[PDB]
RNA sequence: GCUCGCCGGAAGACCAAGGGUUCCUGUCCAACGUUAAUCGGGGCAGGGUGAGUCGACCCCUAAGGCGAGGCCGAAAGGCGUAGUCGAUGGGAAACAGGUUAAUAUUCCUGUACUUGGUGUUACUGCGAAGGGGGGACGGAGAAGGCUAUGUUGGCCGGGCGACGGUUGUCCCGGUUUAAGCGUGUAGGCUGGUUUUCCAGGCAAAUCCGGAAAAUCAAGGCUGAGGCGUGAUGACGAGGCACUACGGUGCUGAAGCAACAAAUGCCCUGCUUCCAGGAAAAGCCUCUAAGCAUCAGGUAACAUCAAAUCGUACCCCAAACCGACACAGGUGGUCAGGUAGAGAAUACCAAGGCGCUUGAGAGAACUCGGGUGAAGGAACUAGGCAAAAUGGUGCCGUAACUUCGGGAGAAGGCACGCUGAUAUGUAGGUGAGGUCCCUCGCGGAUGGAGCUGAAAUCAGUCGAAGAUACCAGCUGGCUGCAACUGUUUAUUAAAAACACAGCACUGUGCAAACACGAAAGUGGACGUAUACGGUGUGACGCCUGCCCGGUGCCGGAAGGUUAAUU
RNA sequence: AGGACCGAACCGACUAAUGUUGAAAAAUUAGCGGAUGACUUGUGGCUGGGGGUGAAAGGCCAAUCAAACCGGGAGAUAGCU
């Protein structure tokens, strides 16, 4: 079992976008920003505990931050991890 | 057999090849094979130390019994075989206890022939005996230099050694080079001549055949510049120098042997 | 026409990378020189 | 949007390398874009990369690297054993359809598959760092059996035509379906089984190897494709309806056969040749110590697990290497039609483009092309350049020659189209059906349909029938080099280098020789029919005289002569 | 069968014209040689500067080669300009 302090750290935010709303509407899939080291098992356990719904499958991907400019100064945004969490057909989060 | 090729193309006109129909046409005996990869003539510093080596056909190594110490057990030749690693052919012999080995193929040996090694082996071609059990005057090959080390002399195709005398614990041998050499009577020898004596009759016929054997072109010292070779330089063809190696040592007649450790064992240099 | 620089990240790392420099004392002196100069980029690794 | 032009073995599509947001959407036009720009690979903001099966990771090793101890070396360090790394190679498993503005073998639908852990059922000698097997391997060549794929016909849907004709032997379109699962075929390889013994396989072995008998011959292994199923499904020409006219909602026929056919598959096959063609693990199988109703193994049933990283986009290029949005360079895969030997070439399909300055004018001169009276190398250093030749079949072909050649020598004839021979021939393919069988994917026969050169005869059009593209100029004398190769990246390709062949000479193996203060290593797991050095340079006929000079080889009595004493 | 023949891909570079502040610090166009072999090409590896490598041109060793490049001795020395 994964300790609940870990679980409280792995979920960072819901992800808002047209793809995310379409995913939730058409495939019962919530899209979340998660911690970089959060595995699929941790994400699933944390959604099943913190949001107390049934998870079927977690798909994950790493988003690489963009290069941006702030007054001729080159900067880079941080990389971050996205999770496609598919709910179990009556879980409705 | 020695057959001349017909001149259907300029690279074939001079080819003379040796066809031995007796050789096994299938693959070698796998348990006795080994990998050996090529060096290009380079040593462990990565430097060329022997020029003119590189390329050539991939070759597997055949483990050959040069010791022939399985005494008192007869064996039967199953087949002659081609060995890319040496001039002589090799014979796969089956020992009556079920063990298989390769030996250098003696002249006239063929499938079905029985062989043996030991102090009580018969004096017939293919049999290995200590030379104090082989009569003086005999023709031998695969001669040992130290007892139990393994055969080291008269291994190349068509070669043999003559036992010319026996004096105490040493025998005198006439080597192929004409040298008379002493070696301890307990050193072993195989009776007969190494086979494939027609090996020296082949003609490669073209540069490519030498490239197939891993021999790279030799550039004459006189075709170089002085910076590269003592023979280098000159307007037009010029020599005017005593011929030397690329490292500047006279190469027409100067002797290079210096081994006082082994001088005793030589009776008369090949000279 | 073929030019002199033909990139390969594996060759780059094996020949100039941090661990290649750390492997010999003269490579470690390269690293010491670059740290003393204050280079923001020690090797080709980053 | 309609026309036009261009590429199409690419200028289309897709991998790997390399790049790194260039991808999609909105907004903006300062700078950047060789012009303008409302546009952009430009600015700014937001969005986008979804895996048990793809790849990495991982197991395994090659070259090579590092290397505990070790050996060696003023120091730094060199080499190297046991090991440990290292792919460009070996090792488990997924397909079809739908979907996004942008991802999909990753999402969804449907249908599969692999490995491993734990729990139950039955059976039970399991056990490795050891043994054996296997994995596991070259070049070339020939042919059969197939598939991809194409063509025609059939089927179904639509059409009846802007100007003579078009209800027919007319026209247009479609005619697609995977992995998996069952079958075990064309073909390839091999005799099988059962006992007993044995100096071999670092010990042992029921395994391997060897020997000896009995007894049986069809047993085993491998194997494309087809068939069935997967699939009552999906897809589907087209048609119906909306639009925010970009596309979506819904419905949906036929979905067959013959012929042709790969460079793909059977095939890591077969045949043959010499230059004689990785390794290790996964895997099978045998045992050691060890445990021995435990463990552990064999299959079945359930259940759990398959993490992590990559995934956008360019990729013969405006995104990679070339300072550039640069006529350059960059490995692999796909492979339609008509003609054609063809991946040449011409025109096209799918698909992609018109190359980021234009508008005029119609001088000299320059560049790239077309044609040219009469002459025809008179040009010039030189026929430089240009012009010309150019296909297939057949006829025919000299000196010389190493007997292979020279030779495509030279030179010449035929060639389109229509009809007949025969409404389509020779030939290929070969159904329905019948005869039989040791029983199927079957053997004999039969031939319908399909497909189809080539020739001859007769006629016929043009100036011209290898009509375009494409596609040898030829002969005579002579120098050099035997030949195929190599070379001055970027003014020299040659007569220069190499070469097979020849000779001399060194070298007896701890070889000579070479790299190395050394240890070592190459030479070579080679052994004088071998290896190094040197010169000469296929072959044929040959290779004369000189050892005084220099060098090398041998001698060693005599003179001279170092350190030492 | 063949370092065999003709000829694309592929590799090369014999001739000419163009280009020469180029489209290009070696190319383009038309022609040209090899094209189963001493062939060609990808990935990785090894050899290091009086050193390597060289079918040998003093060729090549990052647009640099009769002694690479970078830093140091170093403000070498310069009866010369
Ligand atoms: Mg999933
Ligand atoms: Mg993933
Ligand atoms: Mg040599
Ligand atoms: Mg020679
Ligand atoms: Mg020269
Ligand atoms: Mg010199
Ligand atoms: Mg002269
Ligand atoms: Mg002279
Ligand atoms: Mg950007
Ligand atoms: Mg865009
Ligand atoms: Mg502008
Ligand atoms: Mg932009
Ligand atoms: Mg190793
Ligand atoms: Mg080492
Ligand atoms: Mg140590
Ligand atoms: Mg490893
Ligand atoms: Mg690999
Ligand atoms: Mg896309
Ligand atoms: Mg077919
Ligand atoms: Mg993609
Ligand atoms: Mg442009
Ligand atoms: Mg370009
Ligand atoms: Mg073409
Ligand atoms: Mg004009
Ligand atoms: Mg003109
Ligand atoms: Mg003209
Ligand atoms: Mg005209
Ligand atoms: Mg004229
Ligand atoms: Mg005229
Ligand atoms: Mg005339
Ligand atoms: Mg004249
Ligand atoms: Mg004149
Ligand atoms: Mg000309
Ligand atoms: Mg012309
Ligand atoms: Mg003359
Ligand atoms: Mg020549
Ligand atoms: Mg040539
Ligand atoms: Mg040049
Ligand atoms: Mg030139
Ligand atoms: Mg040695
Ligand atoms: Mg010569
Ligand atoms: Mg000559
Ligand atoms: Mg040829
Ligand atoms: Mg070249
Ligand atoms: Mg050209
Ligand atoms: Mg030729
Ligand atoms: Mg050719
Ligand atoms: Mg010169
Ligand atoms: Mg250079
Ligand atoms: Mg110097
Ligand atoms: Mg000084
Ligand atoms: Mg100065």
Residue numbers in the entry:
A (entry chain s): 1 to 93
B (entry chain c): 2 to 272
C (entry chain 1): 1 to 46
Sentences from the paper on this structure:
The ribosome consists of a large subunit (LSU), which contains the catalytic peptidyl transferase center (PTC) and the small subunit where messenger RNA (mRNA) is decoded. For proper tRNA substrate positioning to occur, the tRNA anticodon must base pair with the mRNA in the small subunit decoding site while the tRNA 3′-CCA nucleotides interact with the A loop, an RNA hairpin in the ribosomal RNA (rRNA) of the large subunit.
To probe the structural effects of the A loop mutants, we solved the cryo-EM structure of the CC mutant 70S ribosome in a complex with mRNA and aminoacyl-tRNAs in the P site and A site (non-hydrolysable Met-tRNAfMet) to a global resolution of 2.2 Å. The structure reveals that, in the presence of the U to C mutations at positions 2554 and 2555, the A loop fold is indistinguishable from the WT A loop. In addition, the A loop in the CC mutant also contains the proper 2′-O-methylation of U2552, as evidenced by clear density for the 2′-O-methyl group on the ribose of U2552. The structure of the WT ribosome used for comparison contains the same tRNAs in the P-site and A-site as in the CC ribosome structure, and both structures used paromomycin to favor A-site tRNA binding, which facilitates the direct comparison. These results suggest that the U to C mutations in the A loop interfere with docking of the A-site tRNA’s 3′-CCA end, possibly due to the syn-C74 conformation favored by the mutation. Grafting U to C mutations at positions 2554 and 2555 in E. coli 23S rRNA stabilizes the 50S ribosomal subunit from thermal inactivation, consistent with CC variation serving a stabilizing role in certain hyperthermophilic Archaea.
